[PDB]
Design a protein around this ligand. Structure first.
Ligand code: HEM
Ligand code: HEM
Ligand SMILES: [Cl-]
Ligand SMILES: [O-]
Ligand SMILES: [O-]
Lengths: 150, 150
């Protein structure tokens, strides 16, 4: 059974829905600043999280560096310039999450913070929010599936 | 030490040179058919390889499916439509190579076949060949670095 199928079964979202982001250019629609704002909001919530089991996953990471890694990845993957690879090479999401305990429960907590970040946004329309959360949700469970094999 | 830095040290190519592919659109320059031809040539060489230690790495894989996975990934990453993700989701190269013994020596053998495939091409110019092999070489050693941690 493939990683992507495991993600689809766990998450309620398959790759086809998760990658509906690719049907139009979201970077062109939303703009770079919108991504920076989303990631900054998300990571503010992460680093303020009172649940130590989740907070402490990010303890070896600087918040500002994490914000940059995230929005540069989102920008690159959602139709914008490839800033992430210029700096860091392949996204390699399963490989890069290897050090962290990416459990089913951690996925839901990540996605809670991100939903709250999307709810706080001004410059993201409803169609875009739906497509982005399908992408995020499928991806989070893809990482869960990758975590299970390491 | 990061995966990308380990790749750079091993390979003689850093991420900056490896991702010079992103400076212009190679898909626009070369066209889809050129990619299909390259991957078909490459994989013909792989599956005809008399060295069992290398050949047998690909024994659980169908040749035609492998050709499709490769060129769809190259097309997606080198400026073309995102065919790979439509079908399979994230490239996740480290995760997807987890089942295979991706050693330093296997990297060099892979890159031997690919060089021979590039040498056989008609529709790839010298500037493009240089950029593609920098990308491939850095990537192969990135996978070596990922292999070392699994
Ligand atoms: C499933 C629960 C998740 C957990 C617990 C988690 C945890 C982490 C942690 C601790 C980092 C290191 C922070 C940094 O230094 O940048 C990280 C990095 C990253 N995460 Fe996640 N993550 C999760 C899901 C996701 C999802 C759903 C995506 C994309 C949609 C994603 C994309 C990334 C990216 C692009 C990086 C930067 C990698 C790097 O450059 O080092 N993660 N994650
Ligand atoms: C380092 C030595 C390498 C070895 C021994 C190796 C081996 C393999 C094998 C056995 C597969 C499965 C064939 C399939 O079912 O598609 C595979 C898949 C793949 N490889 Fe490699 N590989 C290497 C390097 C690379 C490099 C340098 C790249 C990209 C530049 C790459 C990209 C891929 C892609 C995109 C797939 C398809 C993954 C999938 O969809 O399952 N590989 N590789
Ligand atoms: Cl990966
Ligand atoms: O993350
Ligand atoms: O490969």
């Amino acid at each position: 059974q493939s990683l992507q199928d495991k993600a689809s079964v766990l998450s309620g979202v398959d790759q086809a829905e998760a990658f509906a982001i690719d049907e139009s250019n979201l970077f062109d629609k939303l703009g770079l600043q919108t991504f920076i704002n989303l990631s900054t909001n998300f990571y503010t919530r992460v680093y303020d999280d009172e649940e130590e089991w989740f907070q402490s996953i990010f303890s070896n990471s600087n918040k500002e560096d994490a914000i940059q890694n995230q929005y540069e990845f989102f920008v690159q993957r959602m139709g914008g310039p490839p800033l992430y690879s210029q700096r860091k090479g392949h996204p390699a999401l399963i490989g890069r999450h290897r050090p962290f305990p990416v459990t089913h429960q951690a996925a839901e907590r990540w996605l809670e913070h991100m939903q709250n970040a999307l709810d706080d946004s001004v410059d993201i329309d409803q169609d875009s929010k739906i497509k982005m959360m399908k992408f995020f949700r499928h991806t989070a469970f893809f990482l869960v599936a990758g975590n299970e094999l390491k």
